[PDB]
RNA sequence: CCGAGCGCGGGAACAACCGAGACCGCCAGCUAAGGCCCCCAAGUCUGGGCUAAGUGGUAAAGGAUGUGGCGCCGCGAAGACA
RNA sequence: GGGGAGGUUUGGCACCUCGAUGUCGGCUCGUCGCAUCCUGGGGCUGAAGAAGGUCCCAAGGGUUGGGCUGUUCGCCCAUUAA
RNA sequence: CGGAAGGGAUAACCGCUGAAAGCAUCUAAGCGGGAAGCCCGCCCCAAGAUGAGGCCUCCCACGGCGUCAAGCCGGUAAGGAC
């Protein structure tokens, strides 16, 4: 009868950027956000690694979506459909881009919300220097 | 490249002359070799793209030392009735059609003189701000499609 | 970005030279600088006016340590100009050259839980030939089958009045130091005794 | 073949397309189509080329010094193209 | 003479709906589309100027009151940036 | 009274320097100009912004069961309500 583990301690990850591909460094800050990398798995809990990323506003993407790259988010009214591409979204709020690439690839329920709150991007870099950040490649 | 000072850097290269020093950013993946009184630049392979950026900062280098070898002068010619030219201080005023005299303002690292209210010369260290500036004088009044009047250049007219 | 509040006292016409300047009246009798906010420790800058004095009876609310703090008669009200910082003490409407124009900020009249004919004159139906059930009705809402939904905001029924409104680039027309009162154009919204909050205008 | 297999796997979802004929059990293993970065199981596997458009991520006649690749002809060190 | 695109027109097929899916036109309320009527920005012109022609960009906003007609449409009348 | 002004990024388009290609080219490196449109700007909504924020000020221990655990009971402070 499988082994159906306990109560765990977080452990949070401090994570560059500068220079990391999107998408590259969006899968490993999921799959770690939850825990598909400790062998300790377990589908339902949650124990993900509290992935902690600074400079997140220095992220390289690949061809032309810079100006190519579109982020759709619709309202409720008529052509509330607000039109934003990544050039004005790294001048802006930079570390929301990394956000949604991580939030978009996360089991998409309950606990998915769950794991999100693990998620903690920044630009700086700095972060809550707290009491755990072990400096992950 | 008499009296000059070329130089390396991780990704520009800078120009020492009489006139000045002006910072050109050339491409990474070449060769600037100094040797002693000569410049030259290779190209890591011969691509359709690598010999674009070749002979591109072959030349642009040969630019950046004539930038502060002599110095340029971007002249222009100005025609019509009440078109006339007036250097107020280091700026040029002109009179050309419009209600109100419009002003010309200094651009940092040119200075331009003027032998006649129709003639108007346009120094400058860069050879890309004395096009874009003198093309912008240019600009103001565009040369008449019909006659002959407004800016131009040494370049024949339209008629 | 000047600022300072008051109420609408009433409002009626003058004589300018010899033409008729229609206006309305606003009260700025003195206002106490009661908090400001540094970005240094707020994240911003803004001066919040405290107004209308106040017998310490209703002021017993620990508003009083506030006061107190800030050295201020305990007022009855108090909003935040936008980064308009005086100097330590207090504005008038010394503020106000007359002839300057100025923004005008204030709570509409309430119009109960109006009627679409009235809250977006609207056009409703024909007094005559035919229905007697619709003549102030808002008609069709929405379409057949697809979407087969209401557009979120169709302009229905609902309440009308008692939203915070500004009305904008108005002559200051006269300013009364001797006994703190402000002359304006006329048209600013609230009904009488009604606060209402003043500011240089948006022009340049 | 569905119908009578709207039972299962893939195809996002979809009786009839690819896979495979569910007697029951199992927290055993091989496989099929199909896939192997993440939502999602399993290669960010090896090696060589192509594409720069997001093509991929679905259209035609028709158009062009787009890119790479392989051939034929005229001209040229008695000096050509520009 | 050829190639399309759209799915507003007239049809075609008879798939859902005949133990009911109320058809025209108007009023009200609109919303969306651009293939743009106007206003803004351009290329050309057989563009002196003014004016206009055509192509391009562009939905943000605007897109009139009547005569007739059940009318949609259109004709007309007085305008209009339209 | 408002539709703005103005700042920025642009559409078509006009351009500087400039190879590939001894010329030339608005371009492939770099740069500048360019709409009532896009983004701010304006007004209003707005921390159920479950990511629930921030700022100033006021009140402040156990008073009893629960040893260990969060809890539970009557009285209270700011104050709130009726």
Redesign the pocket.
């Known amino acids: 009868?499988?082994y159906?583990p306990k109560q765990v301690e977080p452990r949070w990850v401090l994570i560059d950027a500068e220079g990391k591909?999107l998408?590259?460094?969006?899968?490993?800050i999921?799959?770690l956000?939850?825990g598909?990398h400790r062998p300790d798995w377990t589908?339902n809990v949650a124990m993900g690694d509290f992935v902690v990323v600074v400079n997140a506003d220095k992220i390289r993407v690949?061809?032309?979506?810079l100006?190519?790259?579109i982020y759709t988010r619709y309202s409720g009214?008529?052509?509330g459909l607000?039109?934003?591409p990544l050039?004005?979204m790294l001048a802006?709020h930079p570390?929301?881009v990394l956000?949604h690439a991580?939030?978009?690839?996360?089991?998409?329920?309950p606990l998915?919300?769950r794991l999100?709150?693990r998620?903690?991007?920044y630009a700086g870099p700095d972060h809550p220097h707290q009491a755990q950040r072990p400096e992950k490649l | 490249p008499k009296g000059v000072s070329v130089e390396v850097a991780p990704g520009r290269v800078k120009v020492k002359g009489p006139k000045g020093e002006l910072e050109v950013?050339?491409?990474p993946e070449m060769r600037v070799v100094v040797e002693e009184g000569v410049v030259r630049v290779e190209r890591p392979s011969d691509?359709?793209?690598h010999?674009?950026?070749?002979?591109?900062?072959?030349?642009?280098i040969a630019?950046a030392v004539k930038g502060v070898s002599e110095g340029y002068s971007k002249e222009l010619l100005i025609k019509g009735i009440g078109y006339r030219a007036r250097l107020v201080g280091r700026a040029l005023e002109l009179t050309v059609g419009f209600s109100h005299p419009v002003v010309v303002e200094p651009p940092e690292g040119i200075t331009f003189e003027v032998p006649e209210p129709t003639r108007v010369r346009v120094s400058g260290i860069d050879?890309?701000?004395?096009?874009?500036?003198?093309?912008?004088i240019?600009?103001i009044r565009?040369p008449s499609?019909?006659?002959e009047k407004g800016i131009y250049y040494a370049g024949e007219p339209?008629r | 970005m000047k600022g300072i509040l008051g109420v609408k006292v009433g409002m009626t016409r003058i004589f300018r030279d010899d033409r008729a300047v229609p206006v309305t009246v606003i009260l700025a009798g003195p206002c106490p600088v009661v908090?400001r906010?540094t970005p240094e420790?707020?994240?911003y800058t803004a001066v919040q006016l405290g107004f209308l004095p106040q017998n310490p009876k209703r002021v017993?609310?620990?508003?009083?340590?506030?006061?107190?703090?800030?050295g201020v008669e305990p007022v009855r009200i108090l909003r935040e100009i936008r980064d308009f910082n005086p100097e330590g003490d207090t504005v008038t409407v010394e503020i106000f050259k007359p002839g300057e124009r100025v923004?005008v900020?204030?709570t509409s009249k309430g119009r109960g839980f109006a009627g679409?004919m009235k809250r977006?004159?609207?056009?409703?139906?024909?007094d005559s030939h035919?229905?007697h059930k619709?003549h102030r009705?808002?008609?069709?809402?929405?379409?057949?089958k697809t979407?087969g939904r209401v557009?979120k905001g169709?302009?229905m029924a609902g309440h009308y009045g008692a939203?915070?409104?500004?009305?904008?680039?108005?002559?200051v027309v006269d300013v009364i130091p001797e006994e703190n009162l402000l002359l304006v154009?006329g048209?600013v919204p609230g009904p009488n005794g009604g606060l209402v909050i003043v500011?240089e205008?948006?022009?340049?």
């Open positions: 009868k499988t159906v591909t998408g590259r460094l969006a899968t490993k999921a799959t956000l939850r598909k589908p690949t061809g032309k979506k100006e190519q790259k009214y008529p052509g607000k039109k934003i050039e004005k802006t570390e929301r956000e991580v939030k978009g690839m996360l089991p998409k329920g998915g919300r999100f709150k998620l903690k991007v | 950013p050339v491409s691509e359709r793209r010999k674009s950026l070749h002979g591109l900062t072959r030349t642009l630019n050879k890309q701000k004395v096009g874009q500036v003198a093309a912008n240019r600009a565009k499609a019909y006659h339209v | 908090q906010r420790k707020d994240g017993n609310r620990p508003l009083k340590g506030h006061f107190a703090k800030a923004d900020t204030g679409v977006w004159n609207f056009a409703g139906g024909p035919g229905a619709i009705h808002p008609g069709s809402i929405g379409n057949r979407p557009y169709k302009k939203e915070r409104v500004t009305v904008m680039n108005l002559e154009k048209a500011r205008t948006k022009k340049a």
